[PDB]
Structure 1
Amino acid sequence: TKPFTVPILTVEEMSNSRFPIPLEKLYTGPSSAFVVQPQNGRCTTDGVLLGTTQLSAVNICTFRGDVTHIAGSHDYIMNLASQNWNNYDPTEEIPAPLGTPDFVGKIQGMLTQTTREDGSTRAHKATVSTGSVHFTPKLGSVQYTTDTNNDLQTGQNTKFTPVGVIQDGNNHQNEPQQWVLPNYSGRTGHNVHLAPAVAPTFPGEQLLFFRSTMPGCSGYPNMNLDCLLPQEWVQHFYQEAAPAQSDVALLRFVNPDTGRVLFECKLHKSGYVTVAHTGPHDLVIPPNGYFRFDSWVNQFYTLAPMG
């Protein structure tokens, strides 16, 4: 049978699947108090993409299309196009355009556009609030608040490149809310075709998150961003498409230097990881360590307590 495997990349050599930035560390903790249902970075070990997950690490949280000024403000409406600048098809059985951000927050970046006729270009700092009623990706439109009100032109390809997140008001780190999905269709209707919510079912286990620190652009934002799978893992499963021989793949985090294993964990065929541990914990790992698929096991396999 097509042997299953995970890439041999180290945590720092990989990218976060929920925002275009590299992974930084591994984190585990209880999740019973949240609804863990991210839409980006979702894929079966079988290679089946889920939610709004797409292959490009750099295309996550980016938008493309054309814009029109909101008279009397420094705001603009962008009529979305697909990443390749083609028409966006709302008919597809997906939650929203692939790569759409999957959390409620204020993402700041830059809008850039070129005038086809003469090749003149321009850029403006802008922020898109995913918690806003005007955040309607699925319907084909999103809104930005910018610093300008006269330089962006109508009917010209425009792109939004994400940089980081901002926060307002006292009560620091109150936003963004990484575990709260935005309303892809606004008030027009509920979210559709979502990748399922995830939770550790085996007693004594907790989810293992691949963590990054989203850059902050203003205020006191909660910058923690946890994904269920590194972007390269999504890329790998997709191309390998190896058949899962059980519902659980046993992985060992090994140090290529010493050749020794640090801990083992469960990669569920559904596309998420759990370890045997109770309580929040920032994992200390050798910079050169990586994951290695060792064997398929039963869903009733008890993991060696994490260390």
Structure 2
Amino acid sequence: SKPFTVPILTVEEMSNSRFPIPLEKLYTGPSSAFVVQPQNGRCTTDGVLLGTTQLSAVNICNFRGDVTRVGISHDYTMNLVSQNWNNYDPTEEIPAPLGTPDFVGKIQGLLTQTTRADGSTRAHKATVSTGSVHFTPKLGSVQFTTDTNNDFQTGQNTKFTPVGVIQDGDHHQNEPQQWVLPNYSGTSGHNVHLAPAVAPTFPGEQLLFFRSTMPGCSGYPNMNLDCLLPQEWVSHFYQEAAPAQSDVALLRFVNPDTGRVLFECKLHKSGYITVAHTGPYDLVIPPNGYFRFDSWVNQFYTLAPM
């Protein structure tokens, strides 16, 4: 049956699967203090999409719909539609629309709008607070704070394009909280249909993360953003749909110039990586290095230490 592979793209050639920005580096660290349960960048090695994961990075943390002003304030409610402007279905068995933010934080960008009848357009700086009780994407609406109280029109197609994150408070880097899921239905109900939490189980192991730095837009935010799989790996597995022959795919990270293996890791078939290391470590890698699938192993495979 179809041989399994991972892409040959280098880390810096790839994209974060949790926000529309490039990858910067590989990082491993302790996760015992967190529940690591992201909903974007979740895909099995056989190509089954999980959580809120969809196929292109450009759609992540984007929103579309019509807007109405909240009272006489600068806030606007967006009634969500799908990526292609068709109705959103809240009864679909997913946690929230595909691409919905999967962390608690205040994401800043531009809210843009076109008036269909005459082609007039407009844009305003806007922020969505995903920890707000008004963040209810599973129910079909989210709220934005904007720089206007009267320029947006009702009944017109409106898009939010994300740019970065903000923070407010004396406790610097206290938000965003990248490992805290929002309440997709607000106070109305609990989250449903989630991709599972992941954790290392084998002695001496940690998760391996693909790390980016989100742009900061105001205050003193925590800009670190870790994903479990690059977006290009999600797309690759989805298209290849190569069957998993065991629970774990052993990958070697290779320098293509010398041919030498730098380290090895375990790609679990449910779509995340562990390495043999303890503590925070920014991996020291050559920029042309890439991952290579070598063989099908089990969960108890003892890796060469990082």
Q: What CA deviation, in whole Å up to 9, does each residue of 1:52-76 have, x standing for no partner?
A: 0000110000000010111221000
Query: Hey, what's the Cα distance between the residues in 2 that align with 1:144 and 1:5?
Result: 42
Q: What CA deviation, in whole Å up to 9, does each residue of 1:15-43 have, x standing for no partner?
A: 00000000000000110110000000000
Q: What CA deviation, in whole Å up to 9, does each residue of 1:146-177 have, x standing for no partner?
A: 00011110000000000000000011000000
**Per the alignment, in what secondary structure is the counterpart of residue 238 of structure 1?**
helix
Query: Hey, what's the Cα distance between the residues in 2 that align with 1:166 and 1:51?
Result: 25
Query: Hey, what's the Cα distance between the residues in 2 that align with 1:253 and 1:50?
Result: 26
Q: What CA deviation, in whole Å up to 9, does each residue of 1:180-205 have, x standing for no partner?
A: 00000001100000000000011100
Q: What CA deviation, in whole Å up to 9, does each residue of 1:75-126 have, x standing for no partner?
A: 0000000111100000100000000000000000000010000000000000
Query: Hey, what's the Cα distance between the residues in 1 that align with 2:71 and 2:190?
Result: 30
Worse overlay, 296-305 or 165-174: 296-305
Q: What CA deviation, in whole Å up to 9, does each residue of 1:283-307 have, x standing for no partner?
A: 111000011101111222100001x
- Aligned match of 1:17: 17
Q: CA RMSD in A?
A: 0.5
Gap regions ≥5 residues in structure 2: none
- Aligned match of 1:90: 90
Query: Hey, what's the Cα distance between the residues in 2 that align with 1:135 and 1:158?
Result: 17
**Per the alignment, in what secondary structure is the counterpart of residue 58 of structure 1?**
helix
| TM-score, normalised via structure 1 length | 0.99
Query: Hey, what's the Cα distance between the residues in 2 that align with 1:2 and 1:203?
Result: 32
Query: Hey, what's the Cα distance between the residues in 1 that align with 2:142 and 2:268?
Result: 35
Query: Hey, what's the Cα distance between the residues in 1 that align with 2:240 and 2:74?
Result: 47
1:256 positional shift: 1.3
Query: Hey, what's the Cα distance between the residues in 2 that align with 1:284 and 1:108?
Result: 32
- Aligned match of 2:118: 118
Q: What CA deviation, in whole Å up to 9, does each residue of 1:200-222 have, x standing for no partner?
A: 01110000000000000000000
Query: Hey, what's the Cα distance between the residues in 2 that align with 1:298 and 1:181?
Result: 30
- Aligned match of 2:202: 202
Query: Hey, what's the Cα distance between the residues in 1 that align with 2:218 and 2:25?
Result: 24
**Per the alignment, in what secondary structure is the counterpart of residue 294 of structure 1?**
strand
**Per the alignment, in what secondary structure is the counterpart of residue 138 of structure 1?**
helix
Aligned residues between the structures: 306
Query: Hey, what's the Cα distance between the residues in 2 that align with 1:59 and 1:148?
Result: 25
Query: Hey, what's the Cα distance between the residues in 1 that align with 2:168 and 2:32?
Result: 27
Worse overlay, 297-306 or 96-105: 297-306
- Aligned match of 1:4: 4
Q: What CA deviation, in whole Å up to 9, does each residue of 1:242-272 have, x standing for no partner?
A: 1000000000111112211100000000100
**Per the alignment, in what secondary structure is the counterpart of residue 250 of structure 1?**
strand
Query: Hey, what's the Cα distance between the residues in 2 that align with 1:209 and 1:167?
Result: 24
Alignment of structure 1 residues 1-307 onto 2, 5 Å: 1-306=1-306
